[PDB]
Amino acid sequence: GFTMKYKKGTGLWDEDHVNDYKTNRYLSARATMRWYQEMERHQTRNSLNARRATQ
Amino acid sequence: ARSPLANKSPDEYGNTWDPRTGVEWYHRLRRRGAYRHWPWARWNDDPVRQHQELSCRRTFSAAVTGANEGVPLWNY
Amino acid sequence: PRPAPRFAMGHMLPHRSNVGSQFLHTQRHGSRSTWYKKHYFSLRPFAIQRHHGTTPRILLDRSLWKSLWITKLQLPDINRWERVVNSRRVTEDRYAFVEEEGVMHKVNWGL
Amino acid sequence: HYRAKLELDRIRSMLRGRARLERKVGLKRLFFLMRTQTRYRVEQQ
Amino acid sequence: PKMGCEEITRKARRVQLQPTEYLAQHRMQVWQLRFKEMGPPFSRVWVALGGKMRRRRVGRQVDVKDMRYYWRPIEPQYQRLY
Amino acid sequence: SSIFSPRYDWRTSGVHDIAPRDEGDFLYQGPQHVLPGAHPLPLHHPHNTITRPVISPYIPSPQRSHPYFTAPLPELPHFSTTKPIVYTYGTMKERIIAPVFNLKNEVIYTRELDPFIFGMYPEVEELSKNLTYWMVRCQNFASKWDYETREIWRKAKKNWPNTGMGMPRVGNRKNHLYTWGGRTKPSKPWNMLMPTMDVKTWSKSNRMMLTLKMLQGRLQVVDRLTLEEPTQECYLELCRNMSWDVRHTGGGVLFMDGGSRITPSSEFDRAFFFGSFFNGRNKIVRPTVLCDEQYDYNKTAAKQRMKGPKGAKNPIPINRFNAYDAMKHDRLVITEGALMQLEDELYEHKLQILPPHIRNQLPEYG
Amino acid sequence: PFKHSWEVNRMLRELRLEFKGQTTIVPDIPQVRKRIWRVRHIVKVDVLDLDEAKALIGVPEHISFTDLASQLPPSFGRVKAVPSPVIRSKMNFMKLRRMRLRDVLHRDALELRLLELKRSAMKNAEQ
Amino acid sequence: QHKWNHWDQYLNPQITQSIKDLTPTPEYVGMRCGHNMIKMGWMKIGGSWKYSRGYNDRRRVRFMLAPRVSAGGPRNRYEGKLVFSPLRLSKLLWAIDTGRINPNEVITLYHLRQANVVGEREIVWPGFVLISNGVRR
Amino acid sequence: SGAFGCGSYRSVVAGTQNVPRRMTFYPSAYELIQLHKAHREVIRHFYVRDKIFDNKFPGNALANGLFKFVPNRRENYHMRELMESIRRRSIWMHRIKQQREINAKVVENMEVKYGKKAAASMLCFTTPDSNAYFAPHRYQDVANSWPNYWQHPSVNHVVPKPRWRRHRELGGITRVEDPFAVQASDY
Amino acid sequence: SRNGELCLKKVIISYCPSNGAPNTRQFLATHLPHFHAKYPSVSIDLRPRLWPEMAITGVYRDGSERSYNTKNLSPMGIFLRLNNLVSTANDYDQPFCASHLHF
Amino acid sequence: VTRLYTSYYTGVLYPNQLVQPKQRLPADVSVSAILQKRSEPRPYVPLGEVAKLELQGDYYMEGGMFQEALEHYGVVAKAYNYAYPENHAQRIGIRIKLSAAFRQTGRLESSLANIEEVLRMLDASTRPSLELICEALLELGITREALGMKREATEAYEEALEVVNSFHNWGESHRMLRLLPRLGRRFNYNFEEKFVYFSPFDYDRTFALVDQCLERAETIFNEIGDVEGAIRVLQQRKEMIDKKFFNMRDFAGRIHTMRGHWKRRAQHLTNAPTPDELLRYSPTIHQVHRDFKYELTAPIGREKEVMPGVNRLVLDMGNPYRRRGRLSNKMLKDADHKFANYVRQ
Amino acid sequence: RIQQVEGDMFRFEEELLKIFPTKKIFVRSHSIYVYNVALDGRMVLHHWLLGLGF
RNA sequence: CUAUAUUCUUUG
RNA sequence: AUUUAAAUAAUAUUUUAAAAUUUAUUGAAAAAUAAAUAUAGUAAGAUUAUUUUAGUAAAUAUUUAUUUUUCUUUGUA
């Protein structure tokens, strides 16, 4: 349905316009790294798939 | 209820010939939402004089200005 | 810009009352709201902590996180006592308080 | 509903066997006793 | 649901998000044909015309007949109710 | 229990062993005696300047409106605000000037802060809105799932007919009454609320938190956040050399990493960013107090296979600045790049707020 | 009074009697007798002419009761008969409001006079 | 013991030390702690349920005497009814003398939307009517 | 269409006479705000269309050269979001550049009619409280505009002056020497 | 206080100097020296500890302990329970009845 | 139902009824010392009966007949003179009143003598009441202005202000009263519970005394023709009054009707830090002495002042992930060493 | 509801008492509430604030 | 309610 | 077109129970098995936290409003 595809990359940084409902108050030393992994792989997975599909 | 004694002051119980019973008489005494200002003609308004005194100060010579005063408005 | 619901702030998970809301998160079906409460006369454990919600930033070994009381795992040495000092796990010798001359004196717990 | 179980749970020692053993029975006994004596004290003695 | 249950350990159903009603569902048109609301903010009547009309007009009187052509506020219970 | 309830006052004897511990205990000497911890006000955190050191020119006092420089001092270079300063509604109405620290811990040139940003005077309801937003937002919403009456996997049939038995009237006993059962209206992620928060409120509350950090004297302004190497011991070498307390037990540092005066960046300094994962109490956040508008593409019910929460589908990400992580970490370390970016993004915002007889003079004043 | 009808109770209310055992002092004017006549099977009465009332309390005889009434403050408890408890509430509320305004007007008057002294001082100093 | 209220944290920000001091607007009492039972008060949880019949039945969930008029309905929208949202001339003049809008310029609906004097929600087809409300010149 | 200061197309068809308007001096102060935040916006579009990957973790490091936008999307973002934003900014620029041409004329007419002093004094927007929003230290004796109203120098007498002293034996702790007030506890 | 001598001997006050629940620290600050100056004979012993017992305790001259739960109680209340500690000899609790009026 | 209070009605128990202590002059300071700073530039007496006699006395004095108040005070002052030791408070109190009585009847010099004796008795007192010294020198102020020494009278008044500004706590009288408006749970009826107000001219008599003290001073300054003096006095008076009004301040709590949280009053009437003592005693000025021998935490360089204990092994930081498998333990291996190089020395 | 007051707000209220002797006045950090006052009292508040020089 | 009455008026 | 406000968000709505119905299988010359949340104020039963602070269409309950005149008194909306 309409999930707002056009706002996906609109954000200034890599971590916004991403629905992140799996989270906590305190993020540990490696949970933070996990967060920064998740976000950039969320951008990279979705970009590389959209490259592959159309190519 | 439908009692003869509804909505009356105990002095007025004697007058049976005009019972105050009914729903709207309950609304005009406890003055409720159609009657919130009850009697719309109540004392202290007069249509006949509009609370102004009818006295003629208009007298030609200023000497006898108060000549017509105490001219009765009714039998008194 | 309705202000965020305070009942849902995470500090409170009541046990399914009559009153509530669609957004009030009550607990699981068949789980009591306080963990040490297996009965109503159940005591609070003394030095045993159960970390809840966020990952504990310092996990003492005798405490509980996603765990049970597994006593060999929880305390390696029963004689030894574990406490937090200067943001580290620091491990002292366990003492018992025993009245001597009318003050209370510390004796080595094990022996 | 508050029946005052948690205060009267400490009194049971003054009840004989069936009441002092089992909780609810004893609590009914103590609730009855104290309400009774309260009533009596205020209006009669 | 307990870590022993043969009930929950074999999957049966999974309940989804339930759809909401039409936001305007309750403004029903049988009201919108009959009445119309008139008012300044915080006080508004719903007003309607009278039926005595389309059965017997003749023979009654003209005053009681044209007491029917006025807009009138509905009774407050009905207004609260609607 | 409750103060009133008779359960309170219990344990008349036995609460204390009647006998002193022969190490820590002592008698009260008299009115000349200074007790550890004792203070006339209700301090839940009784920290003094030794335990939680504050870095500012003066220890904050009721005589001082803020514990910083009110006039540029003649012995240090003074850099004026990036954008011209306008005094809006809640602003301190007094000049706020803060020293800048080098990475070697000596004081370098002095820099004027913006009272629209660092002067918005904190009142608690706004900060409350901020905090409740952050603590409701930061739950794990995927863990709220629970079983329901139709989810149990029993037979749907009446298990015994209710006619002649003394047994309860029971059929299809997968209900909530029973040990193997499930509720009628359980909790589960797509029924849980995620609060929407508009930009005005976020902006205002974060401004007031920054100002609160100024008034408590816990604000620090630094040239760069930069490490020699990406390694962690370089980071700890830094935190040790300039006296940041990063231990879990100690009060932590909250970084806003901006680049520098000359070369500000929206991205973190790479070198510093990789060294910044220490296990201790510290956090590095994006250099912005604003937020994107929060859109809900299921506002009615529409998409049913949404797992999600119900609410804003664009919650503020975790590396932003907030009330929670401000209240947790004491020193707020702000790079000048961050200062510049804050002023830059808040300029038009503060301009629109002004009354119209005042906004007309803005072009005249340049 | 709960043994008796609400009219008798209204009369007892006008006589300022609530319960059994309460005693009140009321005037001899006709209206009062109109009230006491109706409740006479409850109330028991005694009479004091005003010379005797002047005697009952040490009151010099050259002093009337009108001046004595003119001296005592209106602010006495349960001062008025106001028609409903809400009005009573706002009567007490206004009683407090006049206090606040008394102190505020005091301070504001002081500010006024200080302002005038500073004005005259600056005017006499410049000139 | 004394919790810091909103006045004490206003005077002296020094004592706002942790998140528990961040209590919301005092008009918030708490969660709904009881039952609004029709015709008897606000009752208590674990109270007398004797009067709850109406409450329970309400918890689980004449216009025909009036004639129809004008088959569509009285105020009825149809496609192409011109229903204008009002623009009061006073609002406009206030906007001009305030300094939102150029007097020097032909004022279109676009300039009204851009200057923010009229909100997006207000805009609908057909756009606006210029009404003189309280303006004699 | 409209959107400039001249008029829409349907006034040209209408033939309304808009040409000999009266020119007044309007500072165009609101539009400069809108222009500031329009020009702020255009650049953002140019930045977010031009993102390319730099991934700092090894698993995601196979993409490090590519744009974050799929080219087919990047093109469409150039048409829809970006180059029309330039048009918005453009409109603001036009609406100001008209009016400097007009304000120059108002200033010249008033310079001839009045003289430079009188003219420039009339064309000034100064409000008597403009010091409240710009340099408040010149406004302090006029009104108390502080959030701290107890620290304003007119009300400053209210806040107490403690007598405090540092202590070496307590570790550098400063401590107020004032005696406490005895409190009412009982009734 | 019998024959010119207070029956109370010690007051045990345990508290945590750094942790939380300020009421006892308040009490030590503002209300204690007013008590000590008024009743000099009573030895007050203070017990700083990490997880403090939140109850006050008196010790009388017959060797009787009496304690009051102070958890999140205002220092006014704590002061009052203290002054309640002094005013009792802790010998008995007789009911207040007609036969108990004369001891 | 409405109450008529026809029968006897006991009062309610209410927080304004607290027994409020009297302000005392500090121990080290003597009043005559400050006066020199100014010069620089028990036996049984039926006290119930005599007290009754005394209040009859100042009913006479308030009632506008002074001679009789004088004899009354005479009797009662003989009584107090016998019943109390040297320099007791009620003794010097009643001869304050007695000086006031002499002054009104035309015995001016007697009043002067008496009030000077009051002064030298306030001198020799251990810790006199802060109210009594103020009242005393107010009396000598008015007596002096009656004698025709106006400069010295005004001197006395100004010295009243300079006493009460230094040694008096302005917020103490209203400490318990300040939060009372928060008791009201009802709105349309009984809403005078939310508006409860207590005038400062009642709950501390000291403020009233210094206030009319300055009023008299200002009048004298108007008569003599001193403008600067009058401005000084009115400024001090204004500052006094809003010093008081500042301490009576508060923000409104819940406003509308709040049904049944009645255990909330336990938060409403408590020790409320007064704004005066919020700004005197603020935690950053008046520091909390925090000793480290009772605490398990110190700063870095002070690392060894922690509460000592029997043999200690520093194991590691409490990293929660050492309970997991071998790969999580392959991580976090070098943390500990790196933590020891953070905290060394 | 009166919001944009910045200063000593209690002086504002102490004059607001004189304007509205009968009504109920409440203070909060951001605002001042006057109760049972309609557009009339709004018109007044504005006349007073304009007359006052704001 | 549906049909017949189609101007201010009229049926079942 | 004489003619005054406004805090723009919706997602929820007790609980356990018939005789029934409907769908799809098996078997014998309607029964069993498997799916559903049918309905149940004259069928019913439960519904979780004391020390309390205003009364009894019309009534009662929640929020809220009016200082309308006398010798005293009065919950009216």
mmCIF file of N, CA and C in Angstrom, chain F residues 41-47 60 121-125 127-129 131-132 135 209 212 215-218 323-324 327-328 352 356-357 359-360, chain H residues 1-27 94-95 97-100 116:
data_model
loop_
_atom_site.group_PDB
_atom_site.id
_atom_site.type_symbol
_atom_site.label_atom_id
_atom_site.label_comp_id
_atom_site.label_asym_id
_atom_site.label_seq_id
_atom_site.Cartn_x
_atom_site.Cartn_y
_atom_site.Cartn_z
ATOM 1 N N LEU F 41 17.842 20.917 52.264
ATOM 2 C CA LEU F 41 16.911 20.753 51.155
ATOM 3 C C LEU F 41 16.804 19.289 50.757
ATOM 4 N N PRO F 42 15.657 18.904 50.189
ATOM 5 C CA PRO F 42 15.433 17.533 49.720
ATOM 6 C C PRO F 42 16.218 17.183 48.461
ATOM 7 N N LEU F 43 17.487 16.827 48.626
ATOM 8 C CA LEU F 43 18.321 16.429 47.501
ATOM 9 C C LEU F 43 18.338 14.922 47.340
ATOM 10 N N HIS F 44 17.730 14.429 46.270
ATOM 11 C CA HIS F 44 17.754 13.003 46.005
ATOM 12 C C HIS F 44 19.113 12.595 45.459
ATOM 13 N N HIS F 45 19.784 13.520 44.789
ATOM 14 C CA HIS F 45 21.181 13.312 44.452
ATOM 15 C C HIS F 45 22.006 14.350 45.195
ATOM 16 N N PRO F 46 22.677 13.931 46.274
ATOM 17 C CA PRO F 46 23.367 14.941 47.067
ATOM 18 C C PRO F 46 24.781 15.156 46.562
ATOM 19 N N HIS F 47 24.935 15.444 45.279
ATOM 20 C CA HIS F 47 26.268 15.636 44.742
ATOM 21 C C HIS F 47 26.776 17.041 45.026
ATOM 22 N N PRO F 60 27.447 28.265 40.105
ATOM 23 C CA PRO F 60 26.160 28.950 39.928
ATOM 24 C C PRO F 60 25.520 29.363 41.246
ATOM 25 N N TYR F 121 14.468 29.786 29.000
ATOM 26 C CA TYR F 121 14.494 29.498 30.428
ATOM 27 C C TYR F 121 13.584 28.345 30.791
ATOM 28 N N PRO F 122 14.171 27.296 31.376
ATOM 29 C CA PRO F 122 13.454 26.038 31.544
ATOM 30 C C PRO F 122 12.292 26.131 32.508
ATOM 31 N N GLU F 123 11.138 25.667 32.057
ATOM 32 C CA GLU F 123 10.009 25.409 32.923
ATOM 33 C C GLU F 123 9.601 23.965 32.669
ATOM 34 N N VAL F 124 9.090 23.312 33.698
ATOM 35 C CA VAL F 124 9.148 21.860 33.773
ATOM 36 C C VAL F 124 8.111 21.092 32.948
ATOM 37 N N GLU F 125 6.998 21.718 32.587
ATOM 38 C CA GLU F 125 5.978 20.998 31.830
ATOM 39 C C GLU F 125 6.481 20.599 30.440
ATOM 40 N N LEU F 127 9.719 20.187 29.431
ATOM 41 C CA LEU F 127 10.679 19.117 29.627
ATOM 42 C C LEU F 127 9.977 17.807 29.940
ATOM 43 N N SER F 128 8.828 17.898 30.594
ATOM 44 C CA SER F 128 8.018 16.725 30.873
ATOM 45 C C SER F 128 7.492 16.096 29.603
ATOM 46 N N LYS F 129 6.997 16.934 28.700
ATOM 47 C CA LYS F 129 6.512 16.442 27.424
ATOM 48 C C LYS F 129 7.644 15.748 26.682
ATOM 49 N N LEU F 131 10.407 14.325 28.006
ATOM 50 C CA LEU F 131 10.821 13.105 28.684
ATOM 51 C C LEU F 131 9.833 11.971 28.479
ATOM 52 N N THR F 132 8.544 12.262 28.624
ATOM 53 C CA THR F 132 7.544 11.227 28.421
ATOM 54 C C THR F 132 7.574 10.767 26.978
ATOM 55 N N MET F 135 10.628 8.333 26.763
ATOM 56 C CA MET F 135 10.514 7.059 27.460
ATOM 57 C C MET F 135 9.396 6.186 26.906
ATOM 58 N N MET F 209 16.286 22.402 27.582
ATOM 59 C CA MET F 209 17.224 21.481 28.210
ATOM 60 C C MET F 209 18.654 21.986 28.075
ATOM 61 N N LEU F 212 19.051 24.592 30.515
ATOM 62 C CA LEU F 212 19.148 24.011 31.843
ATOM 63 C C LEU F 212 20.563 23.525 32.099
ATOM 64 N N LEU F 215 22.572 26.607 32.947
ATOM 65 C CA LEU F 215 22.295 27.153 34.270
ATOM 66 C C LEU F 215 22.887 26.313 35.396
ATOM 67 N N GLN F 216 23.082 25.022 35.143
ATOM 68 C CA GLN F 216 23.669 24.128 36.135
ATOM 69 C C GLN F 216 25.190 24.144 36.017
ATOM 70 N N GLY F 217 25.690 24.844 35.007
ATOM 71 C CA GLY F 217 27.120 25.056 34.858
ATOM 72 C C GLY F 217 27.831 23.842 34.307
ATOM 73 N N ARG F 218 27.050 22.947 33.723
ATOM 74 C CA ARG F 218 27.575 21.692 33.222
ATOM 75 C C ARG F 218 27.872 21.670 31.713
ATOM 76 N N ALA F 323 15.896 14.978 26.464
ATOM 77 C CA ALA F 323 15.855 15.284 27.884
ATOM 78 C C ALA F 323 16.422 14.138 28.713
ATOM 79 N N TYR F 324 16.171 12.913 28.269
ATOM 80 C CA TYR F 324 16.579 11.731 29.017
ATOM 81 C C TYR F 324 18.095 11.636 29.117
ATOM 82 N N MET F 327 19.656 14.339 31.123
ATOM 83 C CA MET F 327 19.528 14.147 32.558
ATOM 84 C C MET F 327 20.456 13.056 33.074
ATOM 85 N N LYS F 328 20.793 12.091 32.221
ATOM 86 C CA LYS F 328 21.701 11.019 32.630
ATOM 87 C C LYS F 328 23.171 11.433 32.665
ATOM 88 N N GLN F 352 10.483 34.207 12.780
ATOM 89 C CA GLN F 352 9.037 34.199 12.619
ATOM 90 C C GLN F 352 8.292 34.467 13.923
ATOM 91 N N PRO F 356 5.075 41.547 14.752
ATOM 92 C CA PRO F 356 5.237 42.084 13.402
ATOM 93 C C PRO F 356 5.760 43.510 13.327
ATOM 94 N N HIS F 357 5.661 44.274 14.405
ATOM 95 C CA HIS F 357 6.207 45.618 14.381
ATOM 96 C C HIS F 357 7.708 45.530 14.595
ATOM 97 N N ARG F 359 9.422 42.549 13.402
ATOM 98 C CA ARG F 359 10.029 41.864 12.262
ATOM 99 C C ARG F 359 10.281 42.836 11.122
ATOM 100 N N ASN F 360 9.569 43.953 11.131
ATOM 101 C CA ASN F 360 9.717 44.954 10.090
ATOM 102 C C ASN F 360 11.040 45.684 10.190
ATOM 103 N N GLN H 1 7.674 13.140 52.299
ATOM 104 C CA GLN H 1 8.774 14.029 51.962
ATOM 105 C C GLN H 1 8.383 14.921 50.799
ATOM 106 N N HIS H 2 9.092 16.030 50.645
ATOM 107 C CA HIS H 2 8.732 17.000 49.631
ATOM 108 C C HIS H 2 9.296 16.648 48.262
ATOM 109 N N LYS H 3 8.406 16.475 47.292
ATOM 110 C CA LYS H 3 8.797 16.405 45.892
ATOM 111 C C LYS H 3 8.818 17.821 45.324
ATOM 112 N N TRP H 4 9.758 18.106 44.431
ATOM 113 C CA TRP H 4 9.843 19.439 43.853
ATOM 114 C C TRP H 4 8.663 19.713 42.936
ATOM 115 N N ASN H 5 7.905 20.763 43.228
ATOM 116 C CA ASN H 5 6.814 21.158 42.349
ATOM 117 C C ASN H 5 7.361 22.044 41.246
ATOM 118 N N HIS H 6 6.476 22.651 40.469
ATOM 119 C CA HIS H 6 6.912 23.420 39.316
ATOM 120 C C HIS H 6 7.409 24.810 39.670
ATOM 121 N N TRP H 7 7.057 25.299 40.852
ATOM 122 C CA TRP H 7 7.528 26.611 41.286
ATOM 123 C C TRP H 7 8.950 26.536 41.805
ATOM 124 N N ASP H 8 9.250 25.462 42.519
ATOM 125 C CA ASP H 8 10.557 25.324 43.133
ATOM 126 C C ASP H 8 11.629 25.004 42.112
ATOM 127 N N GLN H 9 11.220 24.444 40.982
ATOM 128 C CA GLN H 9 12.160 24.160 39.914
ATOM 129 C C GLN H 9 12.281 25.349 38.980
ATOM 130 N N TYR H 10 11.362 26.295 39.120
ATOM 131 C CA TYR H 10 11.421 27.520 38.343
ATOM 132 C C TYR H 10 12.388 28.506 38.973
ATOM 133 N N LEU H 11 12.333 28.626 40.293
ATOM 134 C CA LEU H 11 13.237 29.516 41.007
ATOM 135 C C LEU H 11 14.666 29.072 40.812
ATOM 136 N N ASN H 12 14.893 27.811 41.141
ATOM 137 C CA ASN H 12 16.225 27.281 41.310
ATOM 138 C C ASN H 12 16.419 26.006 40.521
ATOM 139 N N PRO H 13 16.801 26.137 39.249
ATOM 140 C CA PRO H 13 17.042 25.006 38.346
ATOM 141 C C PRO H 13 18.141 24.061 38.851
ATOM 142 N N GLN H 14 18.930 24.520 39.818
ATOM 143 C CA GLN H 14 19.988 23.706 40.411
ATOM 144 C C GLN H 14 19.493 22.360 40.914
ATOM 145 N N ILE H 15 18.259 22.329 41.401
ATOM 146 C CA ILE H 15 17.737 21.116 42.011
ATOM 147 C C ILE H 15 16.964 20.216 41.058
ATOM 148 N N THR H 16 16.963 20.503 39.760
ATOM 149 C CA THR H 16 16.371 19.523 38.868
ATOM 150 C C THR H 16 17.509 18.571 38.530
ATOM 151 N N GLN H 17 17.562 17.462 39.254
ATOM 152 C CA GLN H 17 18.710 16.580 39.142
ATOM 153 C C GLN H 17 18.515 15.289 38.382
ATOM 154 N N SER H 18 17.270 14.918 38.120
ATOM 155 C CA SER H 18 17.020 13.619 37.514
ATOM 156 C C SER H 18 15.622 13.553 36.939
ATOM 157 N N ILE H 19 15.309 12.456 36.266
ATOM 158 C CA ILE H 19 14.130 12.443 35.421
ATOM 159 C C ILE H 19 12.827 12.437 36.212
ATOM 160 N N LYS H 20 12.882 12.017 37.467
ATOM 161 C CA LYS H 20 11.669 11.959 38.264
ATOM 162 C C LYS H 20 11.153 13.352 38.638
ATOM 163 N N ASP H 21 11.966 14.380 38.406
ATOM 164 C CA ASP H 21 11.608 15.753 38.772
ATOM 165 C C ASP H 21 10.795 16.401 37.675
ATOM 166 N N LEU H 22 10.637 15.642 36.606
ATOM 167 C CA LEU H 22 10.104 16.118 35.348
ATOM 168 C C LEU H 22 8.600 15.914 35.227
ATOM 169 N N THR H 23 7.919 15.727 36.357
ATOM 170 C CA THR H 23 6.461 15.540 36.403
ATOM 171 C C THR H 23 5.717 16.520 35.501
ATOM 172 N N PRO H 24 4.605 16.071 34.887
ATOM 173 C CA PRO H 24 3.863 16.873 33.908
ATOM 174 C C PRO H 24 2.971 17.939 34.532
ATOM 175 N N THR H 25 2.143 18.578 33.705
ATOM 176 C CA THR H 25 1.207 19.594 34.175
ATOM 177 C C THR H 25 0.369 19.063 35.328
ATOM 178 N N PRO H 26 0.249 19.860 36.396
ATOM 179 C CA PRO H 26 -0.394 19.419 37.634
ATOM 180 C C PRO H 26 -1.869 19.087 37.462
ATOM 181 N N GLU H 27 -2.470 19.519 36.359
ATOM 182 C CA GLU H 27 -3.871 19.213 36.126
ATOM 183 C C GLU H 27 -4.057 17.729 35.853
ATOM 184 N N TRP H 94 -5.965 43.812 8.351
ATOM 185 C CA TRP H 94 -5.060 43.578 9.459
ATOM 186 C C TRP H 94 -3.778 43.012 8.888
ATOM 187 N N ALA H 95 -3.891 42.097 7.931
ATOM 188 C CA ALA H 95 -2.710 41.470 7.345
ATOM 189 C C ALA H 95 -1.843 42.473 6.591
ATOM 190 N N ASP H 97 -1.818 45.992 7.053
ATOM 191 C CA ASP H 97 -1.287 47.004 7.949
ATOM 192 C C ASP H 97 -0.309 46.395 8.954
ATOM 193 N N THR H 98 -0.383 45.080 9.142
ATOM 194 C CA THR H 98 0.550 44.356 10.008
ATOM 195 C C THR H 98 1.899 44.191 9.320
ATOM 196 N N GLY H 99 1.873 44.105 7.997
ATOM 197 C CA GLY H 99 3.086 43.875 7.241
ATOM 198 C C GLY H 99 3.306 42.493 6.659
ATOM 199 N N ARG H 100 2.261 41.677 6.574
ATOM 200 C CA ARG H 100 2.370 40.409 5.842
ATOM 201 C C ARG H 100 2.422 40.627 4.331
ATOM 202 N N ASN H 116 0.882 33.115 4.583
ATOM 203 C CA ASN H 116 0.364 32.336 5.703
ATOM 204 C C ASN H 116 -0.929 32.881 6.307
#
